[PDB]
Amino acid sequence: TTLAFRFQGGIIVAVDSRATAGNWVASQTVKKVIEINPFLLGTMAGGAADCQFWETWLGSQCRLHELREKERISVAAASKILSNLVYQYKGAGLSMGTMICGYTRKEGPTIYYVDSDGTRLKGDIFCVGSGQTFAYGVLDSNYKWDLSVEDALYLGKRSILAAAHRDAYSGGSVNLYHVTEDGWIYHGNHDVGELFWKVKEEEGSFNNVIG
């Protein structure tokens, strides 16, 4: 489960930290966000190898752009390198659901959804992965444009926690990012092991669970 949304105070990016091999839990502590540059984030969903390889490659292509043009690549251009690459591989069996989130002065805060079918969409809200529907349910029903940075950070965290609980193929920990005009700011790792019980108690939610 990965998510990114636009609001008054920029972009929130929230991801879980689980890797699966069928019903085997491969890892609970995996990074699903690639820091392409200080103003550009990539989220990873799908094939682990496919995501890691092609999103670090994207970081190389974005570095070369700023060498040959003496200027950071636009979110639009960075997303379209990745979408044009996966489109060349269409039918080969690549599996990738990515969000390219960042700020440039000409664009403002921008989110692009890119998948291995070759779909590329600009938009304000996306949830990607096995647990996307769970994340949407919570996110869509609490989302305003006017969320405070503090509230938006929590909603992002709470939407991934929601997915971590219900989706068998999401969990481990929530990794949080905030993107502003000044670039991305890491807002820490949050293990679901402790976060679930704290949220249950403090929020009074999750009454489905034996307290």
Binding site: T20, V25, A168, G171, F196, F206, I210
Partner: protein
Amino acid sequence: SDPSSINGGIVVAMTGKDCVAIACDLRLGSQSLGVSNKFEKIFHYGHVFLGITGLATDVTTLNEMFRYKTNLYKLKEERAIEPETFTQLVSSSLYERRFGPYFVGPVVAGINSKSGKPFIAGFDLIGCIDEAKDFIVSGTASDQLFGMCESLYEPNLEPEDLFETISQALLNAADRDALSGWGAVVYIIKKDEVVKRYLKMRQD
């Protein structure tokens, strides 16, 4: 389309000194979707305890069926069924459906009320009896449970020690399986008192 792994869930049983333990997780799902957080997989008929993993409809059906058979048993025999005898009743009943089986991994735990001897057994879906002195495992995380039990377990544990071992064995096995977890229950069974503990565990 693999009946044994649509709903998920695990059961483990261990023997200790003059006691047995049987534990299960609380998850019922439909593949990726977690549906219920309270689906218990351990039932009892008198002092004999039965855990059932596998397809949830067959778990519910077999429990209803064994409650039926052990009720008639008690009325005719004028005593509660013993674990050794129940084990054989489970085996007969599963093998009766040889060419249309119940998709389940049953686990029997109890203390023979006459000999005082602790007793556990497990079965495959068609009725074959695995009787072990040490431990029995069943469900979607049976590989993980075999691993944990084979390292953690030692013989002749006191009830309060045996509780820590079975709990840690189940908890850490469930955390490595997508389709198991979402809460756990542990039954500590002595000759004439049974303690039932709900374990706090990660809810992902």
